[model samples]
Target: AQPSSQKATNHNLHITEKLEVLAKAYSVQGDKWRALGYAKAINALKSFHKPVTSYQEACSIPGIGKRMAEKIIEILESGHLRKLDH
Candidate 1:
């Protein structure tokens, strides 16, 4: 057996999984832009090499705006997004 660092892991799965739900919900609601925004954010998170831990870090990622960064921060603080309940 050998230990090896692999790229198959999702460093931000905890955050991306919840964003997916929101993206789908937005798509179902006919909000194309919002859904697309979430989609971009999800992709950004997926490609991120490490877990994001702060507002500045989330905002620095391309395609992630301040609003999206807020959502990321919320997800980091709580396991779920409060907006999802709306």
Candidate 2:
């Protein structure tokens, strides 16, 4: 069942990319702990099997927490994070 082609897919690329930007920004701004959350959240999404469709689904994922779930919901609905505008 294992295949090399499977390693090339990113089931949640867009969301992870957005989260990565947030993580990097937090790192630059000295919010190391918050950035750590983002990093975990990004990795969770990276390994998630499919795009998250709702807040509950996002929250259920290991390594994703309430705040990050909310961020995922907002990104799903609006295509960008409001926090990133700042």
Candidate 3:
């Protein structure tokens, strides 16, 4: 059986998908700084290589800081974001 936390991870996948879309869009728009940050975050998430169980783990990834890590953990717990859409 899947672990209960797997459900939480499912939500994170959705958020990551949206972030990837936005990152690509930003790149196409030539917003290099924002795109670079998103791309780095995407790479960090992709290369994590294991389940992330805490904010500290998220922050520990290269290129991820407190703010980005908090956003990632929030998406993992919540599934959506107002700031990202705005």
Candidate 4:
């Protein structure tokens, strides 16, 4: 891992936004642990220097598993995460 000051050269910014919102939604529901899990994945995505172009790429990051990777892929492909809907 690089220093916090290190800049991410290339990344999928919009994907992180949706994940961040989903994380906050978890906290709003009184699920702090789930929120933290999402937060960790979101942070990892923010630090990476490349767009996660595949489900496997997303899954490779720490704290991001198959389910989370699928959702992240959904945002990258369609610019949406269905979980945002009630």
Best by TM-score: 1
On the 0 to 100 scale, the lDDT of residue 3 in model 2 is: 44
Residues 23-68 of candidate 4: C-alpha lDDT, one tens digit per residue: 8889999998888878988878876777767888889987778878
lDDT, candidate 3, at 21: 85
Q: Relative to the unseen true structure, what is the C-alpha lDDT of residue 29 in candidate 4, on a scale of 0 to 100?
A: 97
> Which prediction has more favorable TM-score, 2 or 3?
2
What is the alpha-carbon lDDT of model 1 when measured against the actual structure?
A: 0.82
Ranked candidates, highest TM-score first: 1, 2, 4, 3
Clash counts for all predictions: 0, 0, 0, 0
Q: Write the per-residue lDDT of candidate 1 for residues 1-86, one digit (tens) a residue.
A: 58445656656577788899889999999998889889998888777877788888898988888988988888776646444444
TM-score of 3: 0.60
TM-score of each candidate structure, all chains considered together: 0.75, 0.74, 0.60, 0.70
- Per residue, candidate 2 scores C-alpha lDDT tens digits across 1-86 of 56446565656677888888878989999997999888998878777877778888998989988988888888777656445444
lDDT (0-100) at residue 24 of candidate 4? 86
Native-to-model Cα distance after best TM-score fit, residue 35 in candidate 3, in Å: 0.9
Cα deviation at 74, candidate 4, in Å, is 2.1
Off by over 4 Å in 4: 1-8, 77-86
Clashing pairs in 4: none
lDDT of 3 by residue, 1-86 (tens): 65556433443455568669878999899999988888788887775656567878888989778878777777666545444434
